[PDB]
Each structure stands twice: as C-alpha cells, then as structure tokens.
Amino acid sequence: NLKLGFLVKQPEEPWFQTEWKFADKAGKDLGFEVIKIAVPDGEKTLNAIDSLAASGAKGFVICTPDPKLGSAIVAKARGYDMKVIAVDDQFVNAKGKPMDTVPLVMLAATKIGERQGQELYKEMQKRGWDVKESAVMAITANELDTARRRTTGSMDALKAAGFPEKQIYQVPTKSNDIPGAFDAANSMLVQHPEVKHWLIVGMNDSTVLGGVRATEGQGFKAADIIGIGINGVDAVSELSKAQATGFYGSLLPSPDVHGYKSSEMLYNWVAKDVEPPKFTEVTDVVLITRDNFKEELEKKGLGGK
Numbered sequence: 001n002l003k004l005g006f007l008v009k010q011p012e013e014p015w016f017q018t019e020w021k022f023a024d025k026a027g028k029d030l031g032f033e034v035i036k037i038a039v040p041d042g043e044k045t046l047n048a049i050d051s052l053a054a055s056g057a058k059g060f061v062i063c064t065p066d067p068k069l070g071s072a073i074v075a076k077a078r079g080y081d082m083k084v085i086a087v088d089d090q091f092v093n094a095k096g097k098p099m100d101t102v103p104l105v106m107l108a109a110t111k112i113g114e115r116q117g118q119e120l121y122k123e124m125q126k127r128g129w130d131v132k133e134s135a136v137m138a139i140t141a142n143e144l145d146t147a148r149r150r151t152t153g154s155m156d157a158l159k160a161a162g163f164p165e166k167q168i169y170q171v172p173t174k175s176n177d178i179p180g181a182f183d184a185a186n187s188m189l190v191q192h193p194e195v196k197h198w199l200i201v202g203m204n205d206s207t208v209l210g211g212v213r214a215t216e217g218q219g220f221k222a223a224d225i226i227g228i229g230i231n232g233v234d235a236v237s238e239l240s241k242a243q244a245t246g247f248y249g250s251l252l253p254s255p256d257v258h259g260y261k262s263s264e265m266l267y268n269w270v271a272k273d274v275e276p277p278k279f280t281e282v283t284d285v286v287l288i289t290r291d292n293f294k295e296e297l298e299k300k301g302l303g304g305k
C-alpha cells in the first residue's frame, strides 16, 4: 500500500538499526511499508531519493550523512511531491543556519551532554582520583551541531562541577566511529605523558569506545579511564564483555521513540495532511552500566543483552 522511506547515515550502528525496527512497528500498526535505505554519503543520499520515487514512496524520514545537503534533499523531494522529516541530524543551509521549516525529531543534545559530564565527575569522585594528575580528553565533531551541543554540554558540566578548565584537552575526529576516534585520541595521548587518569568525552558510544581503545594501547588499565558513551544500544557488546574496561557505562536515550514517532508523524502528514510539529526533542535518558544494562534494555523493550 503506502510506502515510506527511512534513510539513515550509519546502518551499522545499533542506534539506527533500532530506529528501523520501530519504524517497522509503526508501519505494522498504521498500514504502510517502510523502505530501509543506507545513505552513508551525499551521492547515495540523492540517488536513494530518486530510487524512492521510482518505488512510489510518498515521503521519507532521513538522518542525513551531511547536514549541508538539506537544501538539495528538500529540492529533490519537492520535485517528487514527497514529504520529508529529519531524525537526529538537523538540516542546515549553506551558511550553517538551521532549516527550521523541516520537521525534526531528535534527543535533547545539551541536556544529555550535561548529564554525561555530571556522571563522569561523579564516577571520578567515587574512584578518588587526584585532580592534579587527571585530564579530560574531548573528542569533538564540531561541524555537526548535535555532536557539538553534546560535547560542549559535557565540558560545561565538568567545568561547573569544578574540573579545572586548563586540564580539558580537545581533539577533532575525522569520522564519527571507532577508527576516527582512536586516531584522534592516540595523537592527544602522546602529547600528555603527565596524565595518570583520563575522563573521555565524545558525543556517542563509538567515539568514546575509540578513545578507550587508544588508552589501552598506551598502557592505561581500566581503573584509570572513565568513558561514558551516549546511545546505550551501541555499547551492549562492550558492557557484555567478561572483564571491566575503561568504558564505564552509556547514557541510553530513546531510538525506539525516534523510529516510531517520526514514521507515525510522516504517515499522518502524508495520509491526512496532519502537519507535524517543527521540533520534537526527546528528553528520556537512563545511565546503563555493567550492573544494570540488561534490566534497563528489557525494561525499555529493547530486549536481549
């Protein structure tokens, strides 16, 4: 019957895999088919839209691989009389200004970053580290707004709790994955031999995990590393390991809400011209660690751990 696209930039992340599963549920409930397409670069993104048009889709939810493609995506969709909703990553114009007219569903980036820095600080205090020999490694992706509000939020929180600003070191990552973060973290680590304990800040689980893998290769044991990711679902294989690592826990948001609600809203828009809210910020978050990740995922219906 009705076909709707669900396009994501990183199909390998459990985060997006979960959005896809909940979109399928929305399709089962409301009576539409979801076409699941991977759009890891700009080219694929525009070609995928043409492909959706050929398939007869009336609209799509999309997590763009590049916010600056916003204009192009809007132009092509209009050309095909397709409605568009953005999930997680906001479209921006050439200048970098947000395209506020496109409905957006996303997590509360600032608030969850702040919660990341509060939980880092707390766990540091629990361990008794001497602040004088401690440092924060912030692995940033500042060209991505959502990534930038999380890492700024986290650094702001650490500063607000009393962590010395001069011991916060930032390093850019070229890709939002383990290899990009690994590389980034490694170059920062050799510049700071004086540090005995590291807090690793990054916008998501993969970034933090690459930071943690680099620390391991430079000789730090788990007690001297605290990394708290963001996404939850993406850290299950780490939390499931037999031995504890420097990856202490993850902040679990609601990818399930993002996949169903964006899909449901697209459908009401397509099927009834019910126009969606322009901005839907989901604030849900829970900290998962080795001790509770299974309880918490099951309690949220993201079962198996």
Ligand SMILES: O[C@@H]1[C@@H](O)[C@@H](O)CO[C@H]1O
Binding pocket: 013, 015, 088, 089, 146, 147, 176, 203, 204, 230, 231
């Ligand atoms: O790439 C991140 C993704 O891993 C998830 O955290 C939602 O936001 C996107 O920007």
